[PDB]
Design a protein around this ligand. Structure first.
Ligand SMILES: Nc1ncnc2c1ncn2[C@@H]1O[C@H](COP(=O)(O)OP(=O)(O)O)[C@@H](O)[C@H]1O
Ligand SMILES: Nc1ncnc2c1ncn2[C@@H]1O[C@H](COP(=O)(O)OP(=O)(O)O)[C@@H](O)[C@H]1O
Lengths: 975, 346, 342
């Protein structure tokens, strides 16, 4: 009977308040019950009106934006319109009580008035209202208006007009005393411990411990720290319910098992919403001292209490290693079956999976996950729903969407939950609530067990037809309206779980989402927040322990214990993980995040880029060293054979002196290049994944920070390291310069960044819109230009995905959330076929499809989804670009032939340098792939000809230097 | 010869390159065939298990299931078919002279990954059943190489099938069972009562040696030739079903188009992967690193093989006892995700 | 089982790019790992020898030696550990990912001052250590987990050509004709032994089996667990020594030659003992099999390779977790390998 919410312990205050409320209600007077949340206004009302066979309760929860039409809609299924107009209730023997909860919540207009409050004043004073369609007067006959509201001193509560409160008697309800709460939960704990009769003497100490913990956490964790630190006796009721569930669905219990079970429930009810780690430590010490004081046992940290039924038939504490292995195998099956995503399982992920599972296994168990973006909220929710047999439903709310789409989605979900009894987990992001009307609809859905205005009129009648058909399908014997609708709301409460995903709790819309009354009092708040440094250490180690990293000598640095986040440093891998974590922390600190959550997506992207880049670089270095060593060995063997023992062979041997000395120099430099490989790969990954949205000065400052961090942990790196000299080759650079790039180092770096993002789509922020034509020139005629503002963009994008062309979507600040599957790369694989779900029907990905997003408006509105899941790159005009463009224009307008000759000479010289490099590579390959003498003589002659051509072509550079020195003044004045 | 129970310890420990997905027993010679998640197909002797006899990589993707057939003719070789994730069913040949796998042909026709196959000989003609992720269950012809009939019995993709002559029951991902008469290609009955996707479903073939669930109840069921079915799902449960008799191509009775759970076995700690029937027992394996043995008469797990593998347990099988052409030898082989194969002998 | 006699004809012919130097067998799978003079590590499936399972340019020069070990952790997933010793003054530690059939480089061991010539891997209850020796006259022993060196000593004036590890005792064969048993955790020698006139090629211990040389004599030898060993050199002679019991940190005194074998026509390269039988090849393109009891050759294997025969591997039969497979693999100078199964 603990699960039944109609159970009330009769105390002195309870029976007194119930009797006075009933006596006031029988006097035909309005009643406004005042008091802090969790006082028990609704409780004493339900207790008073439950035993009466002549009153009925109608429950409306008022939101910030509540209108009269909501009250009318919530009453049309309970009342009738009879012209005797008169709004009589449907029942002829029982009156109707219109419970209007949170009256203080509907907002004031521009002129300081409330529509709902004035409507209720009209209801109780004039006993009627005016009906808007046909302009007629109705007369309320047997409806009593009873309200419940918090004191106006609470934030979010506004003062009420005295013209409305004059007609309503007011009863205040404070919190019960600590002795009273101890007695109440002592009765609940006796009821629970009837399941375990051999610990029947511990009911009172457990209740005293729980009430003491509640009082202490209310004293410590008040509203002044965070807005969501609102504690109530409802928290103790939730703790009692969780204790009963974990006892009933568990094995035979002992004292240590009971204490740890209760402490786990206390962690999940009270400390789940805590933000700071200091508050977590305070709660840990509070639990320690409470158990020591009242319950005279192992470690009681959050990670050490892992109670789950995923491994057995009972809810019991399980080991971390076997749980991690089980979750890994189940997630492998999930990635094979439903959605393929390469994410790493860690201890915090395991704990969050356990608590989401605990929330979803409840009845009417809704959850509100709060944390940074790319933390793993929606995938964890979908995985837990898949483990529990739920059906995931994500509303495809996009741009150019209205109330009708969301109402249809909610109606379909409700119909599936009730008619088709399909248990459904609904994921609602903060970006799926476009307007406050959606939030009000969801608040009404959570507060009640349906939405009333979605079923009105002929829609209501056809809903009755469908439910009657389904009820005769099950053979249940019920005929009246009330029993059928009770079945409806019970089925919705049983078979629907709502999950809220919030990425920026500081946002005003998300703040209203959190501070909503029904969302706060029903959902289980989970403040995951950002990743603590232990979790980042775990995931970084788990995804870099599969690469060649330890191939050089490593002297362990002597650093502070507080500056090491991993295990004590013994290898290069731990140093790399600590370096990356330190740079992530320093980057988030120096970008002035404030108290906003910090998304770990940059860390994960940097890790993956480092993995693939160090794998490729190590393979290339090993191959090059093998080639140069076998080439030197072959040259030595040929020289020895010639000495032991023909003019062409002698000339070929004598003509490879420069090649021999270059090869010897490379073999000498192999050790130095192998020592500094890991640091170069780290800095390259940081450039790829961190520095996209930075100017040159911020990039230099962050590079200085990264270099001093990288030298702190005794990791070597190239002193003259450069991104262009490392990631940009001559082939790529010449292709870009033929495509139309500028001669800027910054623009070349950004082009290398956008052309190496094979995982996440690149976001181009180019105000001049030159990169549109640049990338159109790169892919030739296969490039297609789409926009988010044009009709028919969906079908064009689907056709381009089916064909496999390269798509550039303009206006990136008007992001359309239908392509969230394309941005997050949540593809599905059908053998050799890769399909993605765009809009409502899945389409086939050809594999040559590429996505670019462009936006020419700086300081635009980029959603945190797109912002976290793309490689955003800025394209700004720096000083060097100004000087170069000004010089090019003035040289074209001064001596056009000179400028044409100069640009042709530069293109020719760099083309010959590329040809010389390719010739050297071909020479090495042909030497290692052993007629041939003539081929190598021709190669040597071609190389000599190219060298002579460059020597002749370098006779005009001082004139260009004199020209740029002459025009530097106009360049600097222009900038 | 029928009430044999395997010992506490396995007779041998066969090591395979990666996760073992399916294992099959040769009905005639003591040799076991082991599939592989890497796509390989091994063949290990029952007495010299250190080295394989023949193995080859035919699929580029993971093998999902396989079965063998010792063909007999009234006018004589072992046929190995193998489903995989490559949308293909490769048919092999087992020559006993030099113990080498001989590839016969590759069977195509599925638009998605194929899960289960079944092979049987009917009057000197052999047919190959198949079910895939494209919601299509098919029965093909080995000699002709072409398809014979294709139909879609389930709203979600089908995961396992089993054939009793011309009747096939096909469990699927939509938590339901359906019996379809293959030559007519129409559904007959539905099995509802599971809440999680069906892992493997198979018939309860009759025996004459008393077992409660392997005997006919009425003369009409004996004339039909099938009465019961067993299905294992992800609900950690093994359910025994009862097939209602249709109007006898059979015509489904509208008021008798639903199954009836005769018995529901419970006690597994995770997804029940594979099931098998020997005599009065129901050998089953699950993801709890355990193998049960449920007595069919009493519905109790008489023996539990706790921690047989250190990982998941995928597949097992016994010798078919309802067929007089195969001697029901007392050998059991069990594979799992631990990249190991355990064989129980004597 | 343990009395298997190899067949006359080779069964598998494995082709590589260069001369095979070291061959090691997978202790649980029919997979052969082949190392070449080009440094390319080759993993060849036995039933598909036309193409390798996985190939990797592990070292930039010739690989000199190789060893494998399958870990058995009491708590942690077990995996195969592969080490390679080459002329790059470095040692690479690999891991065979049999899930995908790829080579995963875990870590590298650096510190040897010239080319590494031999390695040896062994496992304690939860500790794995890696030994090595090289031309700079030292025997360096590393740690598999941490990666840094744990012991460094010079046992010989000349440069050690081969080592073997049995727990806390190391025996080193060098270019000089002598050997020395060195205690591992204290780094002090225990006994030496001379008698050869040519540089020593390969030296390894002899383990007891529950036989002339695999049966302990007295209880004091049972407590130590070591009585004999095997070594061979370019003398075309394989000799069995007797290990004197030191004054037990043990305190050290000569090796008693109890058996000598003659019949090889050139310098031998490898030594392997399979129960009652001893296997050894040489540069005479022949593999000679020797009985332990009689001490005389039983079968010969002529003309397997046109060039020299480099290495042999036979599975360890004194280990509980290692099954004694009836198999052996040999490598040759002619870019060819031979596999004998069943
Ligand atoms: N006998 C009792 N006396 C006082 N409070 C009680 C008693 N029984 C239960 N409660 C508490 O009253 C709470 C119900 O409060 P509720 O009516 O939801 O507050 P509100 O009026 O703000 O909605 C329950 O969570 C329960 O802990
Ligand atoms: N434990 C993890 N290991 C590796 N990557 C992770 C992990 N958790 C999340 N991610 C990254 O986050 C992405 C999915 O999380 P996401 O759904 O973006 O979080 P949110 O719900 O806050 O938007 C994946 O692309 C993945 O790369």
């Amino acid at each position: 009977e603990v699960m039944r919410p109609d159970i009330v312990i009769p105390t002195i205050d309870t029976i007194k308040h119930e009797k006075i409320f009933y006596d006031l209600l029988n006097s035909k007077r309005g009643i406004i019950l005042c008091g802090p949340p969790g006082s028990g206004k609704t409780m004493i009302m339900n207790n008073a009106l439950r035993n009466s066979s002549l009153y009925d309760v109608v429950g409306i929860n008022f939101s910030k934006d509540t209108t009269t039409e909501h009250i009318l809609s919530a009453l049309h299924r309970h009342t009738n319109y009879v012209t005797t107009l008169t709004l009589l209730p449907k029942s002829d023997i029982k009156n109707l009580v219109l419970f209007c909860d949170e009256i203080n919540l509907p907002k004031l207009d521009k002129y300081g008035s409330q529509n709902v409050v004035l409507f209720l004043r009209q209801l109780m004073e004039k006993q009627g209202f005016w009906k808007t369609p046909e302009n007629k007067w109705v007369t309320i006959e047997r409806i009593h208006i009873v309200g419940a509201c918090n004191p106006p001193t609470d934030p979010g509560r506004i003062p009420m007009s005295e013209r409305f409160t004059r007609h309503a008697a007011i009863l205040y309800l404070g919190y019960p005393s600590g002795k009273s709460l101890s007695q109440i939960y002592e009765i609940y704990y006796k009821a629970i411990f009837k399941l375990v009769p051999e610990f029947r003497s511990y009911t009172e100490p457990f209740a005293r411990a729980s009430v003491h913990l509640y009082n202490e956490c209310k004293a410590r964790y008040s509203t002044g720290l965070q807005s969501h630190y609102l504690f109530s006796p409802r928290e103790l009721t939730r703790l009692v319910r969780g204790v009963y569930t974990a006892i009933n669905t568990g094995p035979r219990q002992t004292l240590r098992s009971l204490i740890r079970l209760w402490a786990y429930e206390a962690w999940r009810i009270f400390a789940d919403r805590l933000v700071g780690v200091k508050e977590k430590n305070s709660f840990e010490q509070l639990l320690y001292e409470t158990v020591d004081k009242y319950l005279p046992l192992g470690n009681i940290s959050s990670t050490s209490l892992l109670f789950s039924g995923l491994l057995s038939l009972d809810f019991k504490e399980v080991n971390k290693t076997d749980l991690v292995n089980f979750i890994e195998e189940r997630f492998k099956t999930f990635c094979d079956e439903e959605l393929e995503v390469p994410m790493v399982i860690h201890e915090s992920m395991v704990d969050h999976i356990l608590r989401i599972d605990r929330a979803l296994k409840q009845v009417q168990g809704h959850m509100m996950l709060i944390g940074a973006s790319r933390t793993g909220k929606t995938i964890l929710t979908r995985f837990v729903a898949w483990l529990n047999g739920l059906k995931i439903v994500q509303p495809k709310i996009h741009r150019h969407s209205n109330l009708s789409d969301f109402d249809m989605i909610l109606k379909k979900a409700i119909s599936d939950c009730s008619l088709k009894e399909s248990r459904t987990c609904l994921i609602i992001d903060e970006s799926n609530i476009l307007e406050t009307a959606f939030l009000e609809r969801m608040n009404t859905l959570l507060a009640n067990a349906d939405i009333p205005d979605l079923f009105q009129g002929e829609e209501y009648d056809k809903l009755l037809n469908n439910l009657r058909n389904k009820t005769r399908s099950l053979g249940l014997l019920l005929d009246t309206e009330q029993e059928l609708y009770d079945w409806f709301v019970g089925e919705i409460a049983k078979n629907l779980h709502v999950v809220f995903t919030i990425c920026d709790p500081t946002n005003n819309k998300s703040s209203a989402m959190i501070s909503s009354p029904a969302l706060f009092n029903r959902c289980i708040i989970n403040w995951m927040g950002d990743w603590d440094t232990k979790t980042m250490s775990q995931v970084a180690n788990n995804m870099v322990d599969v690469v060649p990293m330890e191939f050089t000598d490593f002297i362990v640095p002597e650093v502070n214990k507080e500056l090491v986040f991993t295990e004590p440093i013994q290898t290069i891998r731990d140093a790399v993980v600590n370096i990356l974590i330190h740079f992530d922390r320093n980057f988030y600190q120096k970008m002035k995040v404030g108290v906003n959550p910090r998304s770990p997506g940059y860390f994960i992207d940097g890790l993956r880029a480092l993995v693939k880049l160090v794998t490729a670089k190590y393979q290339d270095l090993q191959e090059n060293q093998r080639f140069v060593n076998v080439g030197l060995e072959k040259l030595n063997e040929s020289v020895l054979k010639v000495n032991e023992l023909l003019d062409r062979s002698i000339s070929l041997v004598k003509s490879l002196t420069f090649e021999k000395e270059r090869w010897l120099n490379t073999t000498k430099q192999f050790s130095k290049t192998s020592q500094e490989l890991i640091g170069n790969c780290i800095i390259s990954s940081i450039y790829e994944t961190y520095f996209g949205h930075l100017n040159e000065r911020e990039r230099g400052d962050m590079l200085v920070i990264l270099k001093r961090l990288l030298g702190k942990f005794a990791v070597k790196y190239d002193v003259n390291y450069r991104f262009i000299d490392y990631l940009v080759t001559l082939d790529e650079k010449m292709k870009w310069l033929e495509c139309g790039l500028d001669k800027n180092d910054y623009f070349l770096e950004n082009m290398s960044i956008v052309m190496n993002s094979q995982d996440a789509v690149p976001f181009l922020l180019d105000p001049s819109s030159h990169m549109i034509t640049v990338i159109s020139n790169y892919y030739g005629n296969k490039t297609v230009l789409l926009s988010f503002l044009e009709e028919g963009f969906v079908k064009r994008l689907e056709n381009a995905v089916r064909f496999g062309s390269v798509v550039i979507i303009q206006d990136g600040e008007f992001f359309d959330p239908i392509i969230s599957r394309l941005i997050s790369r949540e593809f599905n694989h059908a053998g050799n076929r890769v399909t993605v779900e765009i809009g409502d029907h899945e389409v086939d990905v050809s594999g040559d499809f590429k996505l670019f997003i462009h936006s020419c408006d700086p300081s635009g509105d980029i959603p945190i989804f797109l912002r976290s899941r793309v490689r955003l790159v800025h394209f700004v005009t720096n000083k060097e670009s100004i000087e170069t463009r000004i010089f090019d224009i003035t040289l074209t307008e001064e001596n056009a032939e000179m400028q044409r000759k100069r640009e042709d000479l530069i293109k020719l010289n760099t083309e010959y340098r590329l040809k010389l490099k390719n010739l050297e590579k071909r020479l090495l390959e042909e030497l290692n792939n052993s007629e041939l003498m003539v081929t190598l003589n021709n190669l040597k002659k071609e190389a000599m000809n190219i060298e002579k051509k460059l020597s002749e072509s370098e006779e005009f550079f001082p004139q260009f230097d004199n020209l740029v020195e002459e025009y530097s003044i106009i360049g600097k004045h222009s900038v | 010869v029928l009430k044999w129970i395997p010992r506490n310890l396995p007779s041998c420990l066969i090591n395979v390159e990666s996760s073992v997905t399916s294992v099959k027993l040769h009905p005639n010679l003591p040799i076991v065939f082991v599939a592989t998640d890497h796509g390989k197909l091994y063949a290990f002797d029952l007495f010299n298990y250190t080295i394989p006899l023949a193995s080859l990589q035919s699929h580029t993707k993971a093998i999902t299931s396989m079965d063998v057939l010792f063909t007999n003719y009234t006018n004589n070789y072992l046929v190995i078919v193998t489903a995989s994730k490559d949308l293909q069913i490769h048919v092999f040949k087992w020559v006993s002279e030099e113990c080498k796998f001989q590839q016969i042909r590759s069977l195509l026709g599925h638009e998605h990954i194929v899960s289960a196959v079944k092979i049987w000989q009917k009057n000197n003609d052999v047919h190959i059943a198949s079910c895939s992720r494209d919601q299509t269950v098919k029965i093909w012809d080995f000699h002709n190489g072409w398809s014979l009939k294709t139909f879609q019995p389930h709203s979600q993709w089908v995961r396992s099938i089993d054939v009793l002559g011309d009747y096939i029951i096909s469990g699927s991902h939509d938590t339901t069972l359906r019996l379809t008469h293959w030559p007519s290609g129409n559904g007959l009955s539905v099995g509802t009562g599971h809440e999680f996707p069906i892992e493997k479903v198979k018939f309860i073939h009759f025996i004459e040696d008393e077992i409660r669930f392997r005997t006919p109840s009425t003369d009409r069921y004996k004339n039909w030739g099938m009465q019961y079915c067993v299905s294992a799902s992800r609900d950690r449960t093994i359910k025994i079903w009862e097939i209602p008799l249709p109007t006898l191509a059979p015509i489904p009775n509208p008021t008798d188009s639903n199954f009836r759970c005769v018995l529901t076995l419970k006690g597994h700690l995770s997804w029940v992967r594979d099931i098998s029937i020997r005599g009065q027992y129901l050998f089953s394996c699950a993801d709890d690193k355990s193998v049960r043995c449920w007595d069919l008469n009493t519905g109790q797990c008489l023996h539990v093989w706790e921690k047989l593998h250190t990982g998941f347990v995928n597949c097992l099988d016994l010798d078919v006892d309802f067929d007089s052409n195969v001697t029901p030898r007392q050998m059991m082989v069990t594979g799992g995700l631990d990249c190991k194969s355990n064989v129980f002998m004597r």
